[PDB]
Amino acid sequence: PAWMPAYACQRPTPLTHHNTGLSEALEILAEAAGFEGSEGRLLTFCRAASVLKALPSPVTTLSQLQGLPHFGEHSSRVVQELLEHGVCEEVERVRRSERYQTMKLFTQIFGVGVKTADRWYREGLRTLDDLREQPQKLTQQQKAGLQHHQDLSTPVLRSDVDALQQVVEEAVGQALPGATVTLTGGFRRGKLQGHDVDFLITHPKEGQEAGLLPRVMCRLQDQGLILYHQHFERSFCIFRLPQPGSWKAVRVDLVVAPVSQFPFALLGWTGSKLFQRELRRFSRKEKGLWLNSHGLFDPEQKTFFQAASEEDIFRHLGLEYLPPEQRNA
DNA sequence: CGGCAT
DNA sequence: CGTAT
DNA sequence: GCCG
Ligand SMILES: [Cl-]
Ligand SMILES: [Mg+2]
Ligand SMILES: [Mg+2]
Ligand code: NA
């Protein structure tokens, strides 16, 4: 074989694709590589899984992997075992291991990453109750993650997104007339659920957005909508989202950008995570330009590319434009 | 050999 | 260290 | 783990 460019930003990856079983197995090995501190192996297994999401048809024979980028001896063997036996011994051993299950449990807590989870694992901790019994080990961020863990493990749905966008738009409009709110993240790519909702806030007049996020947060807090906030241009918070007769905690990310940076922030925050890593790698390695959510920098001329749209950025990098629903790498 | 996004 | 895509 |  199939046409397959090496970088994920060079090919469409739709929301619904084939090979979900094969990719999920490779993504288990990627996650486990991360849990052992091997970011390089994590990346290769993520990239191999993503290649399968971009293929036109189901892989039913090992020969369909010939020539595909990021498939070497290890990733090919995993696919071969799945095709020949329906199961891969290495994947099952990882999946069922105490180490994997505990690291997955701990790293899913808001405020806990691999290094913290591994430290706790090495100390003999295994359950969330173990963590509650030792609150001296916890940051304020981790305390919020643990206190709201049940709700934060409940997938966020589109009905929640629409309600949250309304309350964010109300607070933003009270804080700065003319400011806008754009849904980003996985929901913009067409996903039907997420672990959070991501919003990007700007104003059409450059500079007017300075100081906006503290004003938005104060207004949300005054409506009783904020359970946790980090206290700036990014706010990783937990909202008290009204439900009929009650409420549920929901993770919400709010990001402010000046309008000059909006296309870059929209591109970055729409993802996917792998798509953006691959896009930034492509930009630096293939074009010599440095990309992030603030701009696209030419380090030789020492200038920033002025963009008005995501399309402008793709074109400047020599890439065919992909709409958000084709960025699900 | 080392890079692997910022 | 954690967070984000 | 794969590749530039
Ligand atoms: Cl989905
Ligand atoms: Mg998200
Ligand atoms: Mg988010
Ligand atoms: Na976490």
Task: Extract the tokens encoding A162.
Answer: 């629409």
Confirm if A242 and A286 have CB atoms less than 8 A apart.
Answer: no
Q: Is A196 an annotated catalytic residue?
A: yes
Ligand of minimum distance to the alpha carbon of A193: 1
Helix (H) or strand (E) holding A54: helix A39-54
- The reply to whether A312 belongs to the active site is no
Nearest CA-CA partner of A271 in A1, A45, A50, A5: A50
State CA A252 to chain mean position distance: 13
Can the peptide bond before residue A153 be classed as cis, meaning omega within 30 degrees of 0?
no
Residue A162 a catalytic site member: no
Q: Is any atom of nucleic acid chain C found less than 7 Å from the CB of residue A328?
A: no
Whether residue A294 contacts residue A239, with contact meaning beta carbons closer than 8 Å, is answered with no
Which ligand has the shortest distance to the CA of A200? 3
What lies within 8 Å, CB to CB, of A284 at 6+ separation is A290, A291
Is any atom of strand C within 7 angstroms of residue A20's beta carbon? no
Going from the C-alpha of A264 to that of each of A112, A125, A141, A257, the distances in angstroms are 28, 41, 28, 9
A7 touches strand D (CB under 7 A): no
Angstrom distance (rounded) from CA A57 to CA A268 = 29
- A212 touches A199 (CB < 8 A): no
Residues 6+ apart with CB under 8 A from A329: A8, A9, A13, A50, A53, A54, A272, A274, A275, A278
